[PDB]
Each structure stands twice: as structure tokens, then as C-alpha cells.
């Protein structure tokens, strides 16, 4: 249907300039104004500006004048935002949105692009399977996990059994220590299924182009 | 610029009870065409914001009739007639009458429910990590209520406070609980010096803990 597909997350150095893309599909690209929004730390939302792809009208929040440049590529139905002269405070999630034309039109948001401004190099995670230290338990459900340790920058994406294990998952926010992120994920399955049936966590880290699977293996008792 | 002031900061409501949240603007949001471009967004844990209400009181497609928006001029209200667990998240008002468009700072709707003890699970360092010289002990304290739980670690029966890092999930939209993860990071050499590792779910009140342990030397 109508989709706004944004650029993947980016690591960029201070003082560079860099482009975010927002590929629109499912509607007449020139028929709707596009907005851009900044969200810092999952908290405050800020409107950056808008661009009308039909006529090139481009209005900015004065706060972002000289920080953001909005263009469109009508040929590819893609909106672009250039972020200039990057500093640490440009680290944030950036959204594109499609405005309504008529009053009754639906509005839409992209999935967001996480920008990390830093001089640090990329480090891929080390992924460790987490299995119980006991041989047996009482609970009719067993909890397993994966520790995703020492990566930079965010994000990583964690799934279980390639996404077929979706219920009963807790993937926790990452914590920063010694300039690396670490997160954990738990999954809870019926005790009658483990370890007879294999459980694997899948961890992708876009910045290092890595994708790893780790099978949960019982303790030897 | 128009300043959008939302109250309260957070609102905690039992399932089935009503909710009301306020958004006040520093300038009239009445535009020259007679319309008032006040919008309400909901941002659920892990998702992009989505509009629920536009032009003060019009419901976006698919939004339950339990939601109503009202107000005029500078005082606006979003009401939920009866709260459901899926309604949790952060509600923002945002005005589009005056450039630049500006947002409120959000009201977090939290669901109230019965107490629930955490399901506690403790995990030894993996063989892979020990291979490379590290030793992280992980403890999950999952699906508890209310949100204020703490963790205490013991090694060979002695409390340890250094090297502990914690993370909390947002509230669960199905069962309205919270979860917490705690990692005790040791060197391999320190881990190998001791035998018993204990994770305790504690409270800031006189209340029994929930404990889980393992031993390096036996299952």
C-alpha cells in the first residue's frame, strides 16, 4: 500500500555532511507534502521542515536553517534530507512523514533512521547463548536468552528462530559501557519443547554488515 | 513559536477506567479558514508516532470510538472512555496552525493491574565467552508488576554491587507487566575463583525476595 521506506541507520563522523533518504510508494508522489521530524532519545519531537514535491515549496523550522536541506527526486519518488556540518547533538532518530492533501486523507510515517554522530570505529557484537545452569526445573515454561555484547553503534536486530519464535520474547534496551553497547534478549518456550527442539537467536548489526546465529545448548550435567 | 504544554507527565489508569489528558497552547490554534489544526499522536513502544485525532475532534481511520478529542482556542483534551492495555504509550499533541509546527512533550499512559511476582532466571557465562576470557552472568526478572523491582547479586553468598548493569523493557501491551535484565560482568579469573552465583529480585519494602542460583561445580 502506501509505504515510506527510509535509509538504514548510519554512523557518521563529526564535521561531515550526510543524506537520509525516504522512498515513497503506493501514491502519487507529487500529490502530497512530505515532512521531516527529529526525535532525540525517544523523547522530544521536533518538526524540521516540509517539502512539496510538485512545486518545490520548501519551508524550514528556523532552528534547522543551515542544518537540514530538503530535496526530492521525482523520478524515483524519493525525498532526501541532507544533514550538514554534523555534531554530536545531531544524533537522533529522523522520520519522514506524508501529509494529507484533502482533509480526509490518511497521513503516514516512515520507520525512522537512527543517526549516530561519532568518531569511533564500528565494532560487531559478540553473541553468546544463555542456557540454564540447572538440569531441570518446576516451571512448565523455560526461559533462554542471548547476550549481545560489546558492539558499536546502535542498532542491532534480534530475532528468535528466524522470527518464528515471536511470542514470549523480551529484548531489552542496550546499556553503554566502555564505549560499547550490550543488550540481552530472553525467550520463554514450553518446557516440553526444549532442548528437544532447537532454539536459535539471530543477531544482525547493520553497521558492521554482520548477521550471526547462536544455538542455545544445554549445560552438561 | 507556539509552546505546547501537556499535562500530566504520566497517567496511570486501571483497565476499564477513564483517562483524560490536557494540551494547552500559548497561542490560538484557530486558523484563518476557521479550522483548528490540533492533532493527537500516539507512539507505542518501539514504533513510529501515529496520528489518532486531527482537527481537534476527528478520529483517524481505524481509531476506536473510545477516543474523543475536544477543546478550542488554546485548551485541548484527549479522553479515553475506558482504558485497554493496548492503549499504552506516549500521547503527543502537535499543532499545525502556526509555522514552525510544534509538539507537546508527551503524556505517558501506564496501565495499572494486580501485583505480579517476577519470573527469575539466572544464566552462567557461556563456554564461548569463557573461551575468550570474559564471564558475564545474566539474570532476567520477567513479567512483574508494579515497575519498582530491584536486583541483588551474591557471589559465594557475599553481596556484590560493582560490575552490575541493568535494563528495563517498556510496559507490555498484552499483560501490562514490566521486565528487567541484569548482567554481572566478571573477569574469567574472578569467575573461576568462586563457585556459587545468586540473583535476587528485591523490593524497597519489607517483602520476601525471589532468588535463583547456580554453582560452577555442579548442576
Amino acid at each position: 500500500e502506501v509505504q515510506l521506506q527510509q535509509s538504514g541507520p548510519e554512523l557518521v563522523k563529526p564535521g561531515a555532511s550526510m543524506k537520509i533518504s525516504c522512498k515513497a510508494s503506493g501514491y502519487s508522489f507529487t500529490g502530497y507534502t512530505m515532512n521531516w521530524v527529529k526525535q532525540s532519545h525517544g523523547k522530544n519531537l521536533e518538526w524540521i521542515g516540509l517539502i512539496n514535491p510538485y512545486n518545490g515549496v520548501t519551508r524550514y523550522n528556523q532552528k534547522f536553517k543551515g542544518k537540514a536541506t530538503l530535496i526530492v527526486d521525482k523520478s524515483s519518488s524519493t525525498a532526501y534530507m541532507e544533514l550538514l556540518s554534523l555534531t554530536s547533538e545531531d544524533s537522533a532518530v529522523y522520520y519522514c512523514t506524508r501529509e494529507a492533501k484533502r482533509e480526509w486523507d490518511e497521513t503516514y510515517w516512515g520507520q525512522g533512521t537512527l543517526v549516530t554522530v561519532s568518531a569511533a570505529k564500528t565494532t560487531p557484537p559478540s553473541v553468546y547463548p544463555l542456557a540454564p545452569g540447572s538440569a531441570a526445573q518446576t516451571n512448565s515454561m523455560v526461559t533462554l536468552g542471548c547476550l549481545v555484547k560489546g558492539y558499536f553503534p546502535e542498532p542491532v536486530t534480534v530475532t528468535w528462530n528466524s522470527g518464528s519464535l515471536s511470542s514470549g520474547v523480551h529484548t531489552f534496551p542496550a546499556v553503554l559501557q566502555s564505549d560499547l553497547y550490550t543488550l540481552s534478549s530472553s525467550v520463554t518456550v514450553p518446557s516440553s519443547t526444549w532442548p528437544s527442539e532447537t532454539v536459535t537467536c539471530n543477531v544482525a548489526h547493520p553497521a558492521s554488515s554482520t548477521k550471526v546465529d547462536k544455538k542455545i545448548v544445554p549445560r552438561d550435567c | 513559536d507556539v509552546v505546547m504544554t501537556q499535562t500530566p507527565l504520566t497517567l496511570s489508569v486501571t483497565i476499564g477506567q477513564p483517562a483524560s489528558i490536557s494540551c494547552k497552547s500559548s497561542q490560538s490554534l484557530l486558523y484563518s479558514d476557521g479550522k483548528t489544526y490540533l492533532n493527537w499522536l500516539l507512539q507505542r513502544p518501539g514504533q513510529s508516532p501515529m496520528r489518532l485525532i486531527y482537527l481537534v475532534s476527528k478520529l483517524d481511520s481505524g481509531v476506536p470510538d473510545r477516543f474523543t478529542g475536544s477543546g478550542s482556542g488554546t485548551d485541548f483534551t484527549l479522553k479515553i472512555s475506558r482504558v485497554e492495555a493496548e492503549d499504552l504509550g506516549v500521547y503527543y499533541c502537535v499543532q499545525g496552525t502556526h509555522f514552525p509546527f510544534t509538539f507537546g512533550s508527551g503524556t505517558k499512559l501506564e496501565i495499572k493491574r494486580a501485583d505480579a511476582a517476577p519470573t527469575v532466571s539466572i544464566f552462567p557465562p557461556s563456554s564461548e565467552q569463557l573461551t575468550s576470557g570474559g564471564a558475564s552472568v545474566v539474570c532476567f526478572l520477567n513479567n512483574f508488576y508494579p515497575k519498582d523491582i530491584n536486583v541483588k547479586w551474591k557471589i559465594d553468598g557475599s553481596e556484590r554491587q560493582n560490575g552490575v548493569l541493568n535494563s528495563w523493557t517498556d510496559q507490555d501491551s498484552k499483560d501490562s507487566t514490566y521486565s528487567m535484565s541484569s548482567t554481572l560482568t566478571l573477569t574469567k579469573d574472578e569467575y573461576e575463583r568462586h563457585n556459587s552465583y545468586t540473583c535476587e529480585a528485591t523490593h524497597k519494602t519489607s517483602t520476601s525476595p525471589i532468588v535463583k542460583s547456580f554453582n560452577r561445580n555442579e548442576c
Binding site: 515549496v57 492533501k101 486523507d105 497521513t107 | 486558523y31 492533532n39
Partner: peptide, 10 residues
Amino acid sequence: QFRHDSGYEV
């Protein structure tokens, strides 16, 4: 999500 037909012309 803010104001319909916000890219108005003159």
C-alpha cells in the same frame, strides 16, 4: 500529520 495541504502555493 500536522495540517492538510501544508505545501500551499502562492
